[PDB]
Design a protein around this ligand. Sequence first.
Ligand SMILES: C[C@@H](F)C(=O)N1CCc2ccc(-c3ccc(C(F)(F)F)cc3)cc2C1
Length: 219
Amino acid sequence: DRTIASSRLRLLEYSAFMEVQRDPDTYSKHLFVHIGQTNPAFSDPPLEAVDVRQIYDKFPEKKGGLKELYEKGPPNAFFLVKFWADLNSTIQEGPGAFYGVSSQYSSADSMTISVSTKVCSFGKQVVEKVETEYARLENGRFVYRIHRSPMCEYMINFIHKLKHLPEKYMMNSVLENFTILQVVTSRDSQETLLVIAFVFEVSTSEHGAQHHVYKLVKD
Ligand SMILES: C[C@@H](F)C(=O)N1CCc2ccc(-c3ccc(C(F)(F)F)cc3)cc2C1
């Protein structure tokens, strides 16, 4: 319903960021990509559909691939998010900056979730992070909170090197074959709860971070 939500699990917030301490009291944070928790409005239009077959090649296609997952279903769990990344940090990144991802999910059931994040280049897996997160009772729902999960070294290098490129159009040519695949499962059952394909593009004209959601369909 304009929400990146499975019948079982909803992604409430997603942030990848860099934090620097300017002085003992003062911290500065820059967000590269963001998804902020918004409540669905009755007046909002349904998410557009993107055929899952069209993006198979951008993610690995092997067991544990997007096709096999989509075959296992549930098909209402799979979404696509297109990020416009704010690369104009405008802060002095310095030895000692923290590079992290913070996110929040929500559920009507309590479970132990497991979060697979697969970085991918030309459709090939470069890195997999696996995180376990636990249910916490909030107002009328269970919520899962990942605070400041550290970025892996590959991505820190990728961000800096990317930033170093003279021109935004070259950042976009690189990002065309850069993708991340997120697969949340219930840990002990391994049932698929939420799958999000992440595609990226720099913000040519910078208004800061932007994003767009799409429902992956197999019609
Ligand atoms: C452990 C491993 F999961 C990891 O390190 N991750 C996973 C989650 C994630 C999702 C997006 C970005 C990101 C994408 C584009 C840009 C830029 F704007 F620069 F293009 C900057 C950051 C970085 C990460 C970090």
